[PDB]
Amino acid sequence: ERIVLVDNKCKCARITSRIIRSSEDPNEDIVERNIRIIVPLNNRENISDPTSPLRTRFVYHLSDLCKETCYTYDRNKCYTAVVPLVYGTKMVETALTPDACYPD
């Protein structure tokens, strides 16, 4: 019944809303803006370079994302960082998350 104002899958924010149609009094209703965030406290600040510090601040200018440096691995679109391997050197690909980088 709620109305997802925003669902930002690379900040794990989700502003919904729902008018709490009150007890059947006159129009003394109050609309209601649920919010929800799942901050990781595990990832980098360069989400796609696991050679950086972790994170401390998590800033949500909701104005900005009520409409690109956002910090959760989105499930569906996957990432990578070309990484050297040595068997001689070779500068070669990776797949920084599995089960989504599957060329299928």
């Binding site: 109305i3 609309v31 209601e32 649920n34 919010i35 799942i38 990781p40 406290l41």
Partner: protein
């Protein structure tokens, strides 16, 4: 003697993309044999200006051109010179009209809370701010369905107070406040020339606006970096 020439308006232009120019002649001598002829800046003739008009209520025969041109053929200052010869005018009187910026800003304020206690009048306000030039057209859309034109009332683009030369206008509309329970956000469709697609629609409903009951719900975990 009143012979004014009407430049095209973005109202009709938005309507049918049919830029039109008319130079009507009024309160001249009461004779038939009135001829209408418009010209571009080369002087060449024009299209089917037709549909003769009778004598005015003040007993003067009425005539006006009906000149359709191209929207592109308007944007470089073409003095649309129209000539009308008449019995009284061995010197026919000529008329001309031609092509002589800032982005608008549209908001849609909801009614007042105290408005919503009289329990009849649900006022709604759409608006436009700080734009150049004028001639802008506005209208309100309700579920892909234009409202009653009389249902709303439109302003005219009076100039800005503090801006150098920008313009702004207004429009207001009422409905049953009982309707302000289905809401349907009553989309007000602005229509200004200086927009990327020439329309900058915005809309507002009850669910929009401002709530006075949040409940933020941050969670916190290592089981993250995922955004299911």
């Amino acid at each position: 003697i009143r012979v004014f020439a009407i430049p095209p308006s973005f109202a009709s232009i938005f309507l049918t993309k049919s830029t039109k120019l008319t130079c009507l002649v009024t309160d001249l001598t009461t004779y038939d044999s009135v001829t209408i002829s418009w010209t571009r800046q080369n002087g060449e003739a024009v299209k089917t200006h037709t549909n003769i008009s009778e004598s005015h209520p003040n007993a003067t025969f009425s005539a006006v051109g009906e000149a359709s041109i191209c929207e592109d053929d308007w944007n470089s200052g073409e003095r649309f010179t129209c000539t009308v010869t008449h019995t009284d005018l061995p010197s026919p009187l000529k008329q001309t009209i031609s092509r002589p910026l800032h982005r608008p800003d549209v908001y849609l304020l909801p009614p007042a809370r105290e408005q919503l206690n009289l329990r009849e009048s649900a006022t709604i306000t759409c608006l436009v701010t700080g734009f150049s030039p004028a001639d802008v057209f506005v209208q309100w859309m309700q579920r892909g369905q234009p409202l009653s034109p009389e249902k709303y009332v439109t302003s005219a683009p009076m100039p800005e107070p503090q801006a150098p030369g920008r313009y702004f206008a207004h429009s207001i509309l009422t409905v049953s406040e009982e309707e302000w329970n289905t809401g349907e956000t009553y989309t007000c469709v602005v229509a200004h020339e200086a927009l990327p697609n020439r329309v900058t629609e915005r809309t507002v409903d009850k669910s929009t606006g401002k709530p006075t009951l949040y409940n933020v719900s941050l969670v916190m975990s290592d089981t993250a970096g995922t955004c299911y």
